[PDB]
Amino acid sequence: GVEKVPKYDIPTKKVDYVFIELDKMKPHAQLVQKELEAFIESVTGSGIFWKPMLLAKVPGEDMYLIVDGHHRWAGLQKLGAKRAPSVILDYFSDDVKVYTWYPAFKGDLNEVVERLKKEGLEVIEDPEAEEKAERGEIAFALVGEKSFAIPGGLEEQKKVSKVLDEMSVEGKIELIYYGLKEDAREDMAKGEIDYVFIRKAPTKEEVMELVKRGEVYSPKTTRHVLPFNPDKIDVKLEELF
Numbered sequence: 001g002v003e004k005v006p007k008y009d010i011p012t013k014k015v016d017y018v019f020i021e022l023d024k025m026k027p028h029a030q031l032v033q034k035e036l037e038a039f040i041e042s043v044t045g046s047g048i049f050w051k052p053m054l055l056a057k058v059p060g061e062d063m064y065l066i067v068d069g070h071h072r073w074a075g076l077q078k079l080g081a082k083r084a085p086s087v088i089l090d091y092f093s094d095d096v097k098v099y100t101w102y103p104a105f106k107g108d109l110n111e112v113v114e115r116l117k118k119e120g121l122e123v124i125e126d127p128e129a130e131e132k133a134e135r136g137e138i139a140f141a142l143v144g145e146k147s148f149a150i151p152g153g154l155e156e157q158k159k160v161s162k163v164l165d166e167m168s169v170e171g172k173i174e175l176i177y178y179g180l181k182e183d184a185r186e187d188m189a190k191g192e193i194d195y196v197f198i199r200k201a202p203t204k205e206e207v208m209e210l211v212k213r214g215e216v217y218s219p220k221t222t223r224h225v226l227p228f229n230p231d232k233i234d235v236k237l238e239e240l241f
């Protein structure tokens with residue numbers, strides 16, 4: 001996924017890592033096979049693991065939510081490793097925020113709507129679609145020249161992400177994930193984007209409940225703004241087995 005995000009000043013802080021067993025970490029997002037593959041190539045290439053996982057302790061369980069690190073986690077498991085260096089966050093601090101991403105596309109709206117309807121969704125023209133999506137009352141608003149409601153909740157949201165990645169792979173559309181919906185509207189005015197998909201961002205509380213149910217979001221659903229990026233670390237791959 002091509003990304004476009006606000007140039008956020010986030011400070012690097014020197015926080016120590018701790019090794020946490022991979023089987024104590026819970027994903028909140030579906031994996032992206034290419035990102036998994038790129039991590040595997042990179043870590044096996046250097047033999048240094050330099051970027052700690054960011055975790056949050058799951059209330060009432062001997063388990064951690066993966067805040068950042070899904071492909072590191074999954075890649076290390078696929079290689080046979082058993083742990084990863086991790087930074088434990090104060091996740092429910094006001095200092096940690098969660099937003100979402102806004103998938104936007106240049107291409108044919110009609111092929112996209114057909115394919116959405118092919119996976120059991122509907123796409124209803126609706127001038128209040130964006131207001132409804134922002135309140136969490138529908139799955140996605142689809143907004144460009146016309147405004148459309150896509151009814152539902154999580155299952156319908158995952159079909160939308162799934163259809164778009166299929167059509168991206170097929171090269172029937174160009175797909176950019178925007179950090180901010182207004183940057184997708186700043187660029188749409190310029191003529192670079194036709195349409196943007198708008199959902200209500202998940203809350204921290206919802207993220208944690210989802211993993212407690214053993215469920216996951218589509219890729220590019222959560223967008224965490226953290227109080228810091230951990231400084232880089234000096235851990236050998238051989239230490240993780």
Ligand SMILES: Nc1ncnc2c1ncn2[C@@H]1O[C@H](COP(=O)(O)O)[C@@H](O)[C@H]1O
Binds near residue numbers: 035050071073
């Ligand atoms: N040798 C490495 N050690 C640790 N992380 C890496 C290495 N090479 C690439 N990465 C990161 O692995 C991450 C894989 O995606 P994710 O774990 O979902 O954040 C990317 O953010 C890369 O920066």
